[PDB]
Amino acid sequence: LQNIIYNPVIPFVGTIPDQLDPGTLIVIRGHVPSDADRFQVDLQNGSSVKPRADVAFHFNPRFKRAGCIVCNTLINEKWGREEITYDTPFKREKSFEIVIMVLKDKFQVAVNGKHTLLYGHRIGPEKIDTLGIYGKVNIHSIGFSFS
Numbered sequence: 001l002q003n004i005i006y007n008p009v010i011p012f013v014g015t016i017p018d019q020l021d022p023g024t025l026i027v028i029r030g031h032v033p034s035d036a037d038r039f040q041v042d043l044q045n046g047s048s049v050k051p052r053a054d055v056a057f058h059f060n061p062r063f064k065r066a067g068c069i070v071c072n073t074l075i076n077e078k079w080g081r082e083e084i085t086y087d088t089p090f091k092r093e094k095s096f097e098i099v100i101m102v103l104k105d106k107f108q109v110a111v112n113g114k115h116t117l118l119y120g121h122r123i124g125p126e127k128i129d130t131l132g133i134y135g136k137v138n139i140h141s142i143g144f145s146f147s
């Protein structure tokens with residue numbers, strides 16, 4: 001992997017060091033604490049706090065009861081329609097590997113070496129330049145694979 005970031009402070013907000021062309025991989029390895037309610041991985045257009053940067057891809061594992069993964073897009077500080085994946089592999093007190101692959105018309109996400117979900121592009125992925133990681137999660141490493 002390229003441009004690796006080890007043991008970042010959460011919340012992490014960092015520039016993705018190259019364009020998100022088809023085939024680009026974002027590999028995030030980490031662990032969910034015992035008391036975690038949720039965390040999120042956001043692919044953003046910039047890092048503006050106010051107004052809040054558009055989030056092309058909001059990937060949001062939630063842990064109450066059986067848990068889920070909520071996926072959405074934030075444009076001009078307005079959330080779109082949620083896409084909820086109920087078959088979640090994430091668990092409190094367990095380590096994980098997230099691999100986000102950028103395809104032409106969608107993201108594909110695999111967790112722990114297994115397909116988890118697809119998310120169709122609502123913003124052009126060329127506009128994404130920032131990776132945000134927020135909430136109750138411990139991130140061990142962030143890596144990128146570009147062409």
Ligand SMILES: CC(=O)N[C@@H]1[C@@H](O[C@@H]2O[C@H](CO)[C@H](O)[C@H](O)[C@H]2O)[C@H](O)[C@@H](CO)O[C@H]1O
Pocket residue numbers: 058060070071072079082
């Ligand atoms: C603002 C608010 O409370 N919205 C509720 C949703 O929670 C938000 O969901 C988005 C993604 O769609 C973000 O994760 C944000 O951080 C959350 O506050 C909630 O998911 C739905 C019910 O499922 O209700 C909204 O009112």
Ligand SMILES: [Cl-]
Pocket residue numbers: 063064065
């Ligand atoms: Cl619970």
